[PDB]
Design a protein around this ligand. Structure first.
Ligand SMILES: [Mn+2]
Ligand SMILES: [Mn+2]
Ligand SMILES: [Mn+2]
Ligand SMILES: [Mn+2]
Lengths: 203, 206, 205, 207
């Protein structure tokens, strides 16, 4: 049974970049809905699993196939929002302060500067043509190299792709404050990105 | 724990339309690989389910998201092939004979002939731009109306769409015999399609 | 060069079901963005097509492939929003009024009633796990039968699937008013659905 | 108008790793079908582009949307197979020989050896659940780093992802010889992979 994570900060602590009103809806409604949905999907799985254990028919297997989609969507929503709240911080807690050490060295070697990496990430975020996410990741299969990937809907990065920074590009992440001006939101969010958490995930 | 279904015919019973060589590989290698993969994926999800119970973190949830792709692909392969073997028959068991009853009535009402429906399905099969399936389905949500749908890979039709005829368009279903001439296989398979089974599925709504 | 269509009503004409603030953004910002994007994508096709004619290399073919996504997305945005505005109307213009004729008869035959069809469509809209659309369509390949289909992003219905009603399930279509309660928006929109335009599409299809 | 490229080797030159029967069908039937399809899709799109120029309706835009799927699939099939033939060579033409220069340096930096890069690529290939490809790529957006990506069907790597080695995982690429034993084919193909072409692509930063 999963639960909404505690937040490290108050709803309004990321203003003016992300409003408190968005945070409260995003956290208490959207995220909570993925929590509930994920729990329901795993219960339904459990039941189907027992059922198939005693009656391993094609019909029952098809029934499981049906639930897989909800496990993926709600699991993805749950995990992605947990990641998101953890890589956000108010400036008083280090939000927007550039990373140090190994991550900073890697960013410098690959992208030239933090500014370049961020510019690339915002171009990726703008390029999500639908609902989705952008992730700065460490690829453990190619020598631990940084990349920026896009996912759609609540798809997430798994296995050898370690998420370092997750940025939400669903319209509900910004619409009440920015409406259609999503570029302004993509630009503004970096002032409250927690690069300390990014460095921790990198380690 | 699922297993390969019993076949209603021997591997060579669909000759010359589908070779015995193909049927033997298709059943004993491909379908068996789906059976194994589905069993493994389901077991792994049980394991991760307990792990998530003990420690309901985003990391463990992430792992479950990883396993669902395998449950979907292998589950889909298992179930789709089961449907497939059940809607094929040799001519001695009614393969290639036209459907009966309400299904035939539906086909006449919607397509005007069985030939129109088969032509539509073959066009759908040719249109699968990859590995996939075509299904003739009964749509339970729109008053039980017949339609033809494509899926890719091992995706299947679920919910309100009841598969009546599954046709496999993965290359392994025909390559040894027809090679690149997939149109010839799509054309030839209708001689061994079991419309008796299709009628049954139509009438049952499952 | 495609352009925004003229709306048959002012932005605030669908209240209280759809805010005028929403319609104004949805039309002037979002849809316009699809118009501009589609024009850009078609011109880029022209350019790459000449490029490919002069040098039909794998590299240039690879560029062609690259533009296809924008063609699909912006083309879809343009088309879908045109359909959308055309099947909405204020109640004063017959919004929410039930369909007549052949469409009405087919609906009764297939779904039992207009209410059952609307419920099915709302279930499909709720089922869009992401941004997307639902369409009520006439299927020309199976004898002209009605169906409800979902699409994601700006994917649309083509070929034998004639769109009769399109409903937008992207958050920008409802968020400023309904926020997370998308089900309330899905339920409310039918009060301004133009079923006469649906009937005309059905007969012409 | 695209055309079937010239091969740099005879159909039976990659035996016993890939049969002559396979290469002949793969080239003269499958790839040719992509050539024909891509030319036809491009023609049809030009036609609809003209019609749209005179009649900019949502209906015509819907027809355009329908065509672009064919442009994607056939364009992909065409490009992916051109890549494929160019990164294959018989052993006497240097197939199976390790890459040199900048590519070799990058490979040893990120993977330690060609060994592990090939192992990674084989796991990716086995992981294609349907028809598709694996590509060893140079990512131009992250400082030029190597990676291995999967695509399904005739999807291809575009933009910052530059294909260095393309391996075909469609069943027609191996079934006549290996049937269901796809891992045997993925293992065997490396004996006739042309790393000199891969190095040329890495150095050039494009195909
Ligand atoms: Mn969100
Ligand atoms: Mn099969
Ligand atoms: Mn919209
Ligand atoms: Mn191929």
């Amino acid at each position: 049974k999963v639960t909404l994570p505690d937040l490290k900060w108050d709803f309004g602590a990321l203003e003016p970049y992300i409003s408190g009103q968005i945070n409260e809806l995003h956290y208490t409604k959207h995220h909570q809905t993925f929590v509930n949905g994920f729990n329901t999907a795993v219960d339904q799985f459990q039941e189907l699993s027992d059922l198939l254990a005693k009656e391993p028919s094609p019909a029952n297997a098809r029934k499981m196939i049906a639930i897989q989609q909800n496990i993926k969507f709600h699991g993805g929503g749950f995990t992605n929002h947990c990641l998101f709240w953890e890589n956000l911080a108010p400036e008083s807690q280090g939000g927007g302060e550039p990373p140090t050490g190994a991550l900073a060295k890697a960013i410098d070697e690959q992208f030239g500067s933090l500014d370049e990496l961020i510019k690339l990430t915002n171009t990726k975020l703008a390029g999500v043509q639908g609902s989705g996410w952008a992730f700065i990741v460490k690829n453990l299969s190619n020598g631990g190299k940084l990349d920026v990937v896009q996912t759609y809907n609540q798809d997430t990065v798994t296995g050898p792709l370690v998420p370092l920074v997750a940025i939400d590009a669903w319209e509900h992440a910004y619409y009440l404050q920015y409406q259609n001006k999503k570029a302004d939101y993509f630009k503004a969010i970096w002032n409250v990105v927690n690069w300390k958490e990014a460095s921790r995930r990198f380690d």
